[PDB]
C-alpha cells in the first residue's frame, strides 16, 4: 500500500474490523428506523503512514505489526459501496499523536505521521444519492469527521501548507472603520469603548496594530478572562452597593483566614494538610523513600459548558484536561489526587424510556441534545481522568427542564447549554506554595503538547491525557527537588492560548519577555502567527527556569518523553516583543501596560424580580405515584452510568469512593482519600448545589447549596468547621430579566453572611454568565435559560479517614433519627417531587437557622469522633423518601419507620427537600444521643423515626395507618432504571441488562470473603528484620500511572524500590542484570494506541538490546517478575521472551465495550504461582479498572490447553462464590473468569485487577470490620519478599 504524497509518500494499511456484532446491529436498526434500505454493513479500521524516507523490508513488516492490535473479530472481504471516515482535513487525531510517537520509540523515524479512519462497506444496492448521503451523515461525527469515497483520499490529510504571514490592520490609511473590519471580521467582540482603548494604543505608537495584537487583546478583555461581571459596580432598585461579588467572596477570607495557605493569587487555593510520608523515587538513587512533611492541600474547580454544548466528549475532557494543568501549575511544582465531575441538562427523553414530566421543546440545531452529552460528556470526563490516572470520587448529575412561572413570568428554563464541571485536590509542599521570583534572564519555556489551530468549528476541543501525564511526571520530578526545584514559576496554557499565559507570566513576576516564534513547537506549519500564539491547543503549561537549570529541565523532561521548548527570556523593561525568524519581523511589539490596560469599570444598573410561588396541584399526586416518579427523575436515581466508568483507585490513596458496601450502590455522601500511603489523615470533598430553588428564590438556593455541602461531608471526621474551605461557581443567564439581582442577593447572601457567620472561607471559585440558549423553532424565537446555579464543593484536612460513615445500614439492634433542620417547615417548592409533576410550586426549603446548622456540623463531628453512629444519610434530591430508600439499597434491608410527628402532611413531611439526614446509631445509644444533639440546640429538629430491620418490607407508618409500605427491592430496582437504560443505549446492551437484573435479586449476599490464610501474619518480618532489602526494578513506561503505590507495597514488604522508566533501559542508566525482581506497572501507556501494552512491549521487542536484556532477565533461575494491568497487558505481548508462556491469551476490549472500574471478587486458583502461595482457595474484592481486560484465545484448543496446564491464577466469582462470565460480576467478559496466568515455573505472573490499589485496608471500597492495617493482597508482595530469601 505506498503511493506518492507531495514531497513524502504514503502508505496504506489495512487494519482489523471495527465493530462487534451489536454494534453492527445499532446501525442497522437505525438505517431500518429512517428507512434506509441498507442489506449490510462491515467496517474496518485502516491506517494512513505518511513517510519521509522509505522502510527497509524489516522496518516494513515492523511498521504492519504495530498495526495489528484489537480484539480479533472475523474479516471480511470488502462488498459493496466504500465510505472511509477520517478526521477533518487540518486536523490531528490523539490516536495519531500517540501513534507516531509509538512508531518514533520503535526505531521508525522515516513514519512522519500514522493516522486512523474506519472505512465501511455498505450493500444497499438502490439508494438515491439523497439516501447515500444520509447513509454518510450517519457514520461520522461532523464536527470531526470527514467521510471519503477512495482510501486515496487520505492524502488530504497529511497537506503541508507554507507558513501565513501576519496581517496588519490599516488604522493608518482608513481610521477607526479599519478596526471595526477586523472586529467583525476576526470576530474580536470588542465594546465600543476597546475599539477607542485600541484606536488611541495605536495612534499614540504611531503604526498598525497586527491582527495577532488585536486578537491577544480581544480574549484577554472577554468575560470569560477579565470577569467584568464579578469586578463590577452595582446599583441595585436604585441603590449603589458598597461591594463587587468578588469582594463579597473575599470577604469571606477577612473573615476566616484560618488554615488558608493561598487564595485568589494562584490558579487553585491552598489550605493546611498534615504531616505525613510523601512517597517518591529520589533524585539521586532512584529508589522510592518516604518523606515525613507537610502535604498541604490545593483545590480547584472549572467548568466547560459552551464547548460541551458543541462537542461534548472533547468538551468534558479537556474541562477535566484544563482543570488538572490549575492543580499541577499551582505555586511552584504541585500534585493532582482526586477528581470529582459535575453535569447538568435539560431533559434526557431516552428513547422508549420517556418520563411523564418530560416535554420536547425543540433545541438550537447547532447543538447537541442533553442525551447526547450525558452519553458522550462523561465518557470524555473519565477518558481524562482514567488516561491522565486521578481517581474520580464524588460528583452531581442533574436534569432541569420545563416552562415554569418564576421571576420574568412562564419561561422555558433549563440547560440546553450545560453544566460541564471538573474540580479536584491535590498535595503540595510548604515552600512551593509562594510563586517565586522571576529573574531578568530567566527561560520562558512552553512545556507539553505541539501547537494546532484549535480553539463553531472553534468549540471543537481535542484531548491528548498521556500527553498531559507526562507533563505531571516533569513537575513531580521538580517539586521531588525540594529547595533545588528549578521552576521559578509556572501557569497553566488555558483561554487565549500562549497570548494569554505568557504575557500573564512575565507580569506576575513584575517582568517583560522577549519571544522567538519559531522555537514554540507546532504540528501545523500552515499557522499565522496569530494562530500559533492564540490558539488553545491542549496539555501545555508554561514556566520560568534560570538559565543555569536548564541542563538539569533538559534531563528531567528527557527521561518523562515530555516535550518542551525555551521559547523566550524574561526582560528587566516591561515590553513584549515576539519576534518571527522566519519571516524576519515582528508580529508583536507592546509595551506591556498598554497590553494589560483595562477600559472603565463595569456598572450594573439592575432591579429585582421576584416569582410569587402557585402552590403545588395536588390533583394528580399519591403518595405511592409521587415515590415510583421521583425515583425515574435522572437527579435522584442510581448514578452507577456516571461511576464505573472512571477509575476510582489509582494512587493507593482513595479511603471512600462513591460505591458503598457489600452491595457496592453509589450512594457516598462524600470521598475520602488518605494524605499518604502510610497515614489515617486525609482529604474529603462534597458538593451541594440545589439550582431549581433559584427559580423561586435566588439566597434560598445559595445557602442550601452551601448547607448540603456541609450535611453531605458531615460524617467525616475533620473536628472544627473552619477546616472546610469551599469553591464557589456560579452558572447564571447575565442580563436576563432578574438574573442580575438575583446573582448579587445570592453572592451576598453566601459571602457576606452565611459563610462568615459559620466560619466558612471561599478561597476559590470561578463564574460562567451567559447560561441560556437562543434558536428559531417555528419562525417563534425560542429561549432557555438557566436558573441561577451555584455550584458549592466543600473541601477539607480529614482527622481520621477510618471513621466515616456511609449510608450502609446496620441490622444489629439500632435507632434511626430524622435531623430536620428544615424545623417542620417542610418546603415543596422547587422539589424533585414539584418537578415530577411539572410543577414548580410554592415555596422552597432554606437555611432555616445558622446556629443549628452549626450545632448540626459541630454535634455530627461530635459524634463521629466518638464513634456513636452506625449510618449517615444526608437529606437532599428526593426528600426523606429517597435518603431512608437509598440507606435501604446500601444496607440490603428493611426500614419501619413512623412519620407521625412530621406533620399531618405526610407528602410534605417525605418529600421536602430541608436540610438534616438521618443518623443510625446502636439501640442502647439512642438516650445518650439524643442527648448530645439537644446539648446542641437540636431538641425540636430530632425525630425517633424507628428502625433498620433484615429484609425486603420499606414501610412507612403514621400511627396506626400504612403511608406507604413497598419491597425495597422492587424500589431499588425502579431507582436503577435510569442508569440501566443509560448503560443499555451507551455500552453492550447484554451487559446492561445482566448488571440490572442481578439487582432484583435480593438472594444476592454481597461482597463476601473466605481467607485461606493468616492476614495478619507478617511472613516478610524475618527478612526484613535482617535489613537485607532485595531490589525491585518499579517499571514504568511514558502514561504508566500505577507505580507510586505499587512501590509502597512492594517497600512494605521489605523490598527498596528503585523507579525504572524505560528511558532508563533505553538510554543504559539501568541494567534489568542488577535486579532479581521486576514489576510492570498499570496505567494508560501511549494511552493504549495501537492495543492496550503493546506499543510499551514493541518498543522493547524492536529494539535489539533492550530485548535482550528483557529475555536473559526472564530466563534467569531466580528472577521473580509481575505485570498488573497495562503490565498484564505489556507482558502478555512478551511472550516470546517468558519461558513457559506458550499458552498465555490476550486482553482485548471488555465484551461491555466500557471501561469498568470495580470493586471485584475473585477466588485464587491452584497455579504454580509463586505470588500467590499459601493463598489458594482464597476468595476475596480486588481493585478493577481497565476497559482492556477480556482474556481471548485463539480457539477453544488454546483455552483447553492453558486451563489444563493449570496456569490460571484468578478467576472472577459472583457474590455466590461461583465462577462466573456474568456481568459486572465478571466485569471484562474472561471465559471461566479469568484474570491471572502464572509460567509453568511459577516464576511469572500477570493479572489484570491492582492489588498494589488495596494492599491497605483503609483503601477497600468494602471490607469485612476486623480486618487490620493490612488486606489480603499485602501477601503477594511478601510472598515476593520470602521467595527471594
Ligand atoms: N457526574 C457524576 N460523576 C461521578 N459521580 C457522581 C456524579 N453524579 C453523582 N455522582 C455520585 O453518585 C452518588 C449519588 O449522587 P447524588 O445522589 O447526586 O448525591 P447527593 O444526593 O448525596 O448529593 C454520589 O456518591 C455522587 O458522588
Ligand atoms: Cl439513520
Ligand atoms: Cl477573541
Ligand atoms: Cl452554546
Ligand atoms: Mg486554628
Ligand atoms: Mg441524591
Ligand atoms: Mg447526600
Ligand atoms: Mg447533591
Ligand atoms: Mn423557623
Ligand atoms: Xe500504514
Ligand atoms: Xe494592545
Ligand atoms: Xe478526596
Ligand atoms: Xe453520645
Ligand atoms: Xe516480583
Given at each position: 500500500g505506498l503511493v506518492p504524497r507531495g514531497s513524502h509518500m504514503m502508505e496504506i494499511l489495512r487494519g482489523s474490523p471495527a465493530l462487534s456484532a451489536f454494534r453492527i446491529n445499532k446501525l442497522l436498526a437505525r438505517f431500518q428506523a429512517a428507512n434506509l434500505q441498507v442489506h449490510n454493513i462491515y467496517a474496518e479500521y485502516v491506517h494512513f503512514a505518511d513517510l519521509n524516507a522509505p522502510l527497509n523490508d524489516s522496518e516494513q513488516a515492523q511498521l504492519t505489526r504495530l498495526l495489528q492490535y484489537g480484539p480479533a473479530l472475523s474479516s471480511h472481504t470488502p462488498a459493496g459501496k466504500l465510505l472511509l471516515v477520517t478526521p477533518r482535513p487540518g486536523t490531528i487525531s490523539p490516536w495519531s499523536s500517540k501513534a507516531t510517537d509509538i512508531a518514533h520509540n520503535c526505531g521508525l523515524q522515516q513514519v512522519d505521521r500514522l493516522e486512523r479512519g474506519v472505512a465501511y462497506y455498505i450493500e444497499a444496492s438502490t439508494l438515491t444519492a439523497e439516501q447515500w448521503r444520509q447513509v454518510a451523515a450517519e457514520l461520522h461525527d461532523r464536527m470531526m469527521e470527514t467521510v471519503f469515497s477512495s482510501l486515496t483520499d487520505a492524502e488530504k490529510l497529511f497537506i503541508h501548507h507554507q507558513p501565513a504571514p501576519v496581517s496588519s490592520v490599516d488604522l493608518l490609511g482608513e481610521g477607526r472603520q479599519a478596526l471595526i473590519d477586523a472586529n467583525l471580521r476576526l470576530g474580536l467582540a470588542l465594546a465600543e469603548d476597546e475599539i477607542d482603548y485600541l484606536q488611541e494604543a495605536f495612534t499614540k505608537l504611531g503604526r498598525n496594530p497586527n491582527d495577532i495584537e488585536l486578537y491577544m487583546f480581544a480574549q484577554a478583555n472577554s468575560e470569560h478572562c477579565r470577569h467584568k461581571i464579578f469586578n463590577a459596580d452595582w446599583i441595585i432598585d436604585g441603590k449603589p452597593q458598597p461591594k463587587s461579588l468578588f469582594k463579597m467572596i473575599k470577604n469571606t477570607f477577612e473573615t476566616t483566614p484560618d488554615y488558608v495557605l493561598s487564595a485568589y493569587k494562584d490558579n487553585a487555593a491552598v489550605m493546611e494538610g498534615s504531616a505525613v510520608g510523601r512517597y517518591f523515587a529520589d533524585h539521586n538513587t532512584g529508589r522510592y523513600d518516604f518523606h515525613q512533611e507537610p502535604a498541604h492541600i490545593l483545590m480547584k474547580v472549572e467548568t466547560h459548558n459552551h464547548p460541551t454544548a458543541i462537542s461534548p466528549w472533547p468538551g468534558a475532557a479537556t474541562g477535566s484536561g484544563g482543570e488538572i494543568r490549575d492543580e499541577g501549575a499551582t505555586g511552584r511544582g504541585a500534585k493532582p489526587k482526586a477528581g470529582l465531575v459535575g453535569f447538568s441538562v435539560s431533559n434526557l427523553r431516552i428513547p422508549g424510556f420517556e418520563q411523564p414530566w418530560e416535554e420536547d421543546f425543540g433545541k438550537p440545531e447547532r447543538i447537541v441534545t442533553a442525551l447526547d452529552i450525558m452519553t458522550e460528556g462523561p465518557l470524555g470526563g473519565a477518558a481524562f481522568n482514567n488516561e491522565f490516572g486521578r481517581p474520580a470520587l464524588t460528583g452531581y448529575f442533574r436534569t432541569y427542564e420545563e416552562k415554569v412561572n418564576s421571576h420574568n413570568g412562564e419561561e422555558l428554563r433549563g440547560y440546553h447549554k450545560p453544566i460541564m464541571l471538573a474540580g479536584g485536590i491535590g498535595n503540595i509542599r510548604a515552600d512551593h506554595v509562594q510563586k517565586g521570583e522571576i529573574v531578568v534572564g530567566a527561560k520562558l519555556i512552553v512545556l507539553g503538547g505541539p501547537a494546532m489551530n484549535i480553539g463553531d468549528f472553534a468549540s471543537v476541543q481535542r484531548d491528548n491525557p498521556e500527553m498531559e501525564r507526562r507533563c505531571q511526571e516533569v513537575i513531580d520530578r521538580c517539586w521531588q527537588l525540594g529547595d533545588a526545584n528549578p521552576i521559578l514559576f509556572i501557569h497553566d496554557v488555558g483561554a487565549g492560548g500562549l497570548s494569554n499565559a505568557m504575557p500573564e507570566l512575565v507580569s506576575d513576576g513584575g517582568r517583560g519577555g522577549k519571544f522567538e516564534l519559531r522555537d514554540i513547537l507546532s504540528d501545523e506549519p500552515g499557522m499565522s502567527p496569530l494562530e500559533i500564539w492564540c490558539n488553545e491547543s491542549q496539555e501545555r503549561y508554561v514556566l520560568a527556569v534560570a538559565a543555569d537549570q536548564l541542563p538539569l529541565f533538559d534531563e528531567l523532561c528527557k527521561r518523562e518523553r515530555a516535550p518542551y521548548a525555551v521559547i523566550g527570556d524574561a526582560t528587566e523593561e516591561q515590553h513584549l516583543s515576539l519576534h518571527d525568524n522566519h519571516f524576519d519581523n515582528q508580529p508583536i511589539d507592546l509595551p506591556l501596560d498598554v497590553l494589560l490596560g483595562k477600559t472603565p469599570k463595569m456598572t450594573r444598573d439592575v432591579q429585582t424580580l421576584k416569582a410569587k410561588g402557585d402552590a403545588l396541584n395536588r390533583a394528580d399526586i399519591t403518595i405511592a405515584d409521587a415515590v415510583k416518579r421521583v425515583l425515574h427523575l435522572p437527579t435522584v436515581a442510581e448514578k452507577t452510568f456516571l461511576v464505573t466508568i472512571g477509575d476510582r483507585t489509582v494512587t493507593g490513596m482513595v479511603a471512600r469512593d462513591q460505591m458503598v458496601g457489600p452491595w457496592q450502590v453509589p450512594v457516598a455522601d462524600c470521598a475520602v482519600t488518605t494524605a499518604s500511603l502510610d497515614s489515617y489523615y486525609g482529604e474529603a470533598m462534597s458538593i451541594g448545589e440545589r439550582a431549581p430553588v433559584a427559580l423561586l428564590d435566588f439566597a434560598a438556593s445559595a445557602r442550601l447549596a452551601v448547607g448540603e455541602a456541609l450535611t453531605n461531608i458531615a460524617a467525616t471526621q475533620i473536628g472544627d468547621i473552619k477546616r472546610i474551605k469551599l469553591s464557589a461557581n456560579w452558572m447564571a443567564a447575565a442580563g436576563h430579566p432578574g438574573e442580575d439581582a438575583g446573582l448579587y442577593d445570592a453572592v451576598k447572601a453566601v459571602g457576606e453572611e452565611l459563610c462568615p457567620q459559620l466560619g466558612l472561607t471561599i478561597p476559590v471559585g470561578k463564574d460562567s454568565m451567559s447560561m441560556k440558549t437562543r434558536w428559531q423553532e417555528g419562525n417563534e424565537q425560542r429561549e432557555m435559560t438557566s436558573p441561577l446555579s451555584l455550584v458549592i464543593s466543600a473541601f477539607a484536612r480529614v482527622e481520621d479517614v477510618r471513621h466515616t460513615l456511609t449510608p450502609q445500614l446496620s441490622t444489629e439492634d439500632n435507632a434511626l433519627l430524622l435531623i430536620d433542620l428544615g424545623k417542620g417547615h417542610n418546603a415543596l417548592g422547587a422539589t424533585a417531587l414539584a418537578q415530577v409533576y411539572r410543577q414548580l410550586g410554592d415555596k422552597p426549603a432554606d437555611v432555616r437557622d445558622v446556629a443549628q446548622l452549626k450545632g448540626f456540623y459541630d454535634a455530627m463531628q461530635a459524634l463521629v469522633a466518638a464513634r456513636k453512629l452506625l449510618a449517615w444519610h444526608d437529606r437532599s434530591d428526593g426528600g426523606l423518601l429517597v435518603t431512608l430508600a437509598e440507606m435501604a439499597f446500601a444496607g440490603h434491608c428493611g426500614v419501619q419507620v413512623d412519620i407521625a410527628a412530621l406533620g399531618d402532611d405526610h407528602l410534605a413531611a417525605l418529600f421536602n427537600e430541608e436540610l438534616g439526614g438521618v443518623i443510625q446509631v446502636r439501640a442502647e445509644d439512642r438516650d445518650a444521643v439524643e442527648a448530645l444533639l439537644a446539648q446542641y440546640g437540636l431538641a425540636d429538629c430530632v425525630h425517633y423515626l424507628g428502625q433498620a430491620l433484615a429484609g425486603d418490607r420499606f414501610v412507612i407508618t403514621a400511627n396506626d395507618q400504612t403511608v406507604f409500605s413497598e419491597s425495597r427491592t422492587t424500589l431499588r430496582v425502579w431507582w436503577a432504571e435510569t442508569t440501566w437504560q443509560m448503560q443499555r443505549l451507551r455500552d453492550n446492551p447484554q451487559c446492561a441488562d445482566q448488571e440490572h437484573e442481578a439487582k432484583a435479586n435480593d438472594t444476592d449476599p454481597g461482597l463476601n470473603v473466605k481467607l485461606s490464610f493468616d492476614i495478619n501474619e507478617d511472613i516478610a518480618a524475618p527478612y526484613i528484620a535482617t535489613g537485607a532489602r532485595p531490589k525491585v526494578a518499579v517499571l514504568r513506561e511514558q502514561g504508566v500511572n500505577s507505580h507510586v503505590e505499587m512501590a509502597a507495597a512492594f517497600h512494605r514488604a521489605g523490598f527498596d524500590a528503585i523507579d525504572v522508566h524505560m528511558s532508563d533501559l533505553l538510554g543504559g542508566r539501568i541494567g534489568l542484570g542488577n535486579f532479581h525482581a521486576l514489576v510492570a506497572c498499570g496505567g494508560f501507556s501511549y494511552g493504549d494506541v495501537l492495543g492496550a501494552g503493546e506499543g510499551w512491549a514493541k518498543s522493547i521487542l524492536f529494539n535489539h538490546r533492550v530485548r535482550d536484556e528483557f529475555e536473559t532477565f526472564f530466563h534467569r533461575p531466580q528472577t521473580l517478575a509481575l505485570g498488573v494491568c497495562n503490565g498484564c497487558q505489556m507482558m502478555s505481548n512478551l511472550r516470546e521472551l517468558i519461558p513457559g508462556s506458550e499458552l498465555w491469551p490476550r486482553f482485548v476490549r471488555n465484551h461491555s465495550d466500557r471501561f469498568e472500574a470495580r470493586f471485584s471478587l475473585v477466588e485464587v486458583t491452584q497455579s504454580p504461582s509463586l505470588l500467590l502461595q499459601g493463598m489458594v482457595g482464597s476468595q476475596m474484592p480486588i481493585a478493577v479498572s481497565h476497559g482492556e481486560g477480556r482474556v481471548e484465545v485463539r480457539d477453544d484448543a488454546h483455552l483447553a490447553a492453558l486451563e489444563s496446564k493449570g496456569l490460571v491464577a484468578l478467576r472472577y466469582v459472583d457474590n455466590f462464590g461461583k465462577v462466573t462470565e456474568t456481568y459486572p460480576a465478571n466485569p471484562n467478559g474472561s471465559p471461566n473468569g479469568i484474570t491471572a496466568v502464572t509460567t509453568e515455573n511459577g516464576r511469572v505472573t500477570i493479572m489484570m485487577p491492582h492489588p498494589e490499589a488495596v494492599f491497605?485496608?483503609?483503601?477497600?471500597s468494602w471490607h469485612p470490620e476486623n480486618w487490620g492495617e493490612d488486606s489480603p493482597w499485602m501477601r503477594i508482595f511478601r510472598n515476593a519478599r520470602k521467595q527471594l530469601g
Open positions: 491497605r485496608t483503609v483503601a477497600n
